[PDB]
Design an enzyme around this catalytic site. Sequence first.
Site, PDB file in Angstrom:
ATOM      1  N   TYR A   1       0.834  -1.020  -0.047  1.00  8.39           N
ATOM      2  CA  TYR A   1       0.107  -0.294   0.007  1.00  8.39           C
ATOM      3  C   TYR A   1       1.104   1.554  -0.374  1.00  8.39           C
ATOM      4  O   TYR A   1       2.321   1.326   0.377  1.00  8.39           O
ATOM      5  CB  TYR A   1      -0.871  -0.488   0.994  1.00  8.39           C
ATOM      6  CG  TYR A   1      -0.736   0.675   2.999  1.00  8.39           C
ATOM      7  CD1 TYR A   1      -0.492   1.482   3.007  1.00  8.39           C
ATOM      8  CD2 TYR A   1       0.366  -0.522   3.180  1.00  8.39           C
ATOM      9  CE1 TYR A   1       0.507   1.674   4.302  1.00  8.39           C
ATOM     10  CE2 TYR A   1       0.829  -0.362   4.169  1.00  8.39           C
ATOM     11  CZ  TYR A   1       1.026   0.943   4.536  1.00  8.39           C
ATOM     12  OH  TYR A   1       1.656   1.472   5.923  1.00  8.39           O
TER      13      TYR A   1
ATOM     14  N   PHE B   1      -5.844   5.596   0.341  1.00  5.95           N
ATOM     15  CA  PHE B   1      -4.541   4.779  -0.156  1.00  5.95           C
ATOM     16  C   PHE B   1      -5.038   4.630  -1.295  1.00  5.95           C
ATOM     17  O   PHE B   1      -5.782   4.220  -2.288  1.00  5.95           O
ATOM     18  CB  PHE B   1      -4.562   3.506   0.942  1.00  5.95           C
ATOM     19  CG  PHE B   1      -5.058   4.189   2.487  1.00  5.95           C
ATOM     20  CD1 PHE B   1      -6.087   4.539   3.305  1.00  5.95           C
ATOM     21  CD2 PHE B   1      -4.068   3.511   3.218  1.00  5.95           C
ATOM     22  CE1 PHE B   1      -5.854   4.797   4.268  1.00  5.95           C
ATOM     23  CE2 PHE B   1      -3.903   3.349   4.415  1.00  5.95           C
ATOM     24  CZ  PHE B   1      -4.596   4.413   5.005  1.00  5.95           C
TER      25      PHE B   1
ATOM     26  N   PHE C   1       3.537  10.388   1.599  1.00  4.63           N
ATOM     27  CA  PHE C   1       2.856   9.326   1.905  1.00  4.63           C
ATOM     28  C   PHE C   1       3.452   8.627   2.666  1.00  4.63           C
ATOM     29  O   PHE C   1       4.943   8.034   2.501  1.00  4.63           O
ATOM     30  CB  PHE C   1       2.785   8.189   0.218  1.00  4.63           C
ATOM     31  CG  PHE C   1       1.899   8.071  -1.121  1.00  4.63           C
ATOM     32  CD1 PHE C   1       0.912   7.329  -0.663  1.00  4.63           C
ATOM     33  CD2 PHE C   1       2.052   9.179  -2.021  1.00  4.63           C
ATOM     34  CE1 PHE C   1      -0.105   7.644  -1.183  1.00  4.63           C
ATOM     35  CE2 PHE C   1       0.879   9.662  -2.540  1.00  4.63           C
ATOM     36  CZ  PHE C   1      -0.053   8.897  -2.507  1.00  4.63           C
ATOM     37  N   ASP C   2       2.581   7.853   3.495  1.00  6.74           N
ATOM     38  CA  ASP C   2       3.541   6.460   4.193  1.00  6.74           C
ATOM     39  C   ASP C   2       3.429   5.045   3.220  1.00  6.74           C
ATOM     40  O   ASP C   2       1.705   4.948   2.535  1.00  6.74           O
ATOM     41  CB  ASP C   2       2.624   5.871   5.056  1.00  6.74           C
ATOM     42  CG  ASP C   2       2.987   4.278   5.514  1.00  6.74           C
ATOM     43  OD1 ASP C   2       4.152   4.029   6.295  1.00  6.74           O
ATOM     44  OD2 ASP C   2       1.937   3.825   6.266  1.00  6.74           O
TER      45      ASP C   2
ATOM     46  N   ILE D   1      -7.931   0.305  10.509  1.00  8.03           N
ATOM     47  CA  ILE D   1      -9.055   1.048  10.659  1.00  8.03           C
ATOM     48  C   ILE D   1     -10.023   0.510   9.857  1.00  8.03           C
ATOM     49  O   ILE D   1     -10.145  -0.728   8.789  1.00  8.03           O
ATOM     50  CB  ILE D   1      -8.514   2.613   9.459  1.00  8.03           C
ATOM     51  CG1 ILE D   1      -7.859   2.257   8.279  1.00  8.03           C
ATOM     52  CG2 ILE D   1      -7.607   3.499  10.713  1.00  8.03           C
ATOM     53  CD1 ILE D   1      -8.051   3.836   7.925  1.00  8.03           C
TER      54      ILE D   1
ATOM     55  N   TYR E   1      -9.539   7.643  11.630  1.00 11.10           N
ATOM     56  CA  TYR E   1      -9.316   8.186  13.368  1.00 11.10           C
ATOM     57  C   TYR E   1      -9.862   8.885  13.558  1.00 11.10           C
ATOM     58  O   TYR E   1      -9.584   9.275  15.235  1.00 11.10           O
ATOM     59  CB  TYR E   1      -7.788   8.260  13.379  1.00 11.10           C
ATOM     60  CG  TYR E   1      -6.655   7.280  12.939  1.00 11.10           C
ATOM     61  CD1 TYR E   1      -5.648   6.160  13.502  1.00 11.10           C
ATOM     62  CD2 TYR E   1      -6.479   7.204  11.691  1.00 11.10           C
ATOM     63  CE1 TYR E   1      -5.045   5.955  13.065  1.00 11.10           C
ATOM     64  CE2 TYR E   1      -4.951   6.204  10.626  1.00 11.10           C
ATOM     65  CZ  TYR E   1      -4.616   4.699  11.909  1.00 11.10           C
ATOM     66  OH  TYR E   1      -4.404   4.223  10.880  1.00 11.10           O
TER      67      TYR E   1
END
Length: 126
Positions: A45, A116, A53-54, A73, A99
């Site tokens: 992802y 995402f 971005f992570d 989540i 969140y």
Amino acid sequence: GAPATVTEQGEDITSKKDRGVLKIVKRVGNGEETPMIGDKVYVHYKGKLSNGFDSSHDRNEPFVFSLGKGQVIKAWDIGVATMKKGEIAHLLIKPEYAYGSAGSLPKIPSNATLFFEIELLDFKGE
Ligand SMILES: COc1cc2cc(c1OC)OCC[C@H](C)n1cc(nn1)CCCCOC(=O)[C@@H]1CCCCN1C(=O)[C@H]2C1CCCCC1
């Protein structure tokens, strides 16, 4: 960009139809089995706050979790359950499915919308 495209064109995959989780399939997968609650799921992802971005690739390994177990989540339990092996999907997610008003600082502020891209690599039943 890709978040705006999901806003405009994505499918609402929430039960309540509150546009809390919007999806576009970017690459079709195979199989006609999707994951169900309990499965161990392997994905790559890239995620970001919708405002730019992570990535699992930053850690040089797939991201692994058990589906429907609240290890992620809500939006991921809902969204990944819709995906086929090999699929790449885009999700745009309202805070209620991520969140919330609390956020999760420092990475996620209060009332954040998330984007995402997810590739479903594999999944195996508990
Ligand atoms: C709120 O905290 C984070 C959120 C996100 C990524 C996080 C994270 O932790 C600090 O670090 C990813 C790497 C570390 C080693 N980690 C955490 C977990 N597994 N590995 C468990 C993470 C469980 C929470 O994350 C999620 O549910 C979702 C979906 C699954 C991938 C990660 N993710 C995130 O919300 C990302 C977040 C990071 C900022 C940009 C938006 C995406």
